[PDB]
Amino acid sequence: GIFAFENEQSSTVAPAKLYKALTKDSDEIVPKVIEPIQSVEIVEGNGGPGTIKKIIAIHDGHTSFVLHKLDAIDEANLTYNYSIIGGEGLDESLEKISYESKILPGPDGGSIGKINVKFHTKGDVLSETVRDQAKFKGLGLFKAIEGYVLAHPDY
């Protein structure tokens, strides 16, 4: 099954600056703002579509990871599409989770972040907890990165 959700967040950060933090600089920012995440390492690719990162974390004392794959990036349009594709951090009920994001300009030099999240389930149902766990994580990450650039614009 495929279950799709949309979220939109307003931000006061300038669109190109928010976009850069979410894309080019996320590997650097995330471990600062998500304590359990220790590092983000590129394991395949050099930046082409298909580049895979291992997001290494500890949770409840045990190191694991999720794998993150770049599906498409288009800086000129401030768009970025990625999937979570495996590792212990991806629920066993899921083939993958795909994200399609886009940063639009807002009023007064700010931004609007739009994301479309697609859960690819192995079965025909999407467990509520699986859905909610991942939505909390995703929008927490956007908010954590956004909050970082707000408090540390000179990073």
Side-chain angles (χ1 to χ4, degrees), residues 87-108:
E88 255 160 30
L90 176 66
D91 186 82
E92 49 191 291
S93 75
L94 304 177
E95 300 172 355
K96 63 179 194 170
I97 304 172
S98 294
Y99 300 83
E100 295 165 3
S101 74
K102 192 182 181 162
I103 303 313
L104 300 182
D108 295 328

Side-chain angles (χ1 to χ4, degrees), residues 98-132 134 137-148:
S98 294
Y99 300 83
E100 295 165 3
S101 74
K102 192 182 181 162
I103 303 313
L104 300 182
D108 295 328
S111 286
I112 299 167
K114 287 173 46 184
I115 186 128
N116 195 357
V117 182
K118 308 178 178 203
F119 295 81
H120 291 249
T121 58
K122 298 188 175 177
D124 298 323
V125 268
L126 181 61
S127 152
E128 292 175 341
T129 41
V130 170
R131 181 187 72 187
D132 297 349
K137 190 48 177 73
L139 264 68
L141 171 107
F142 172 91
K143 285 296 162 158
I145 292 170
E146 193 246 357
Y148 184 84

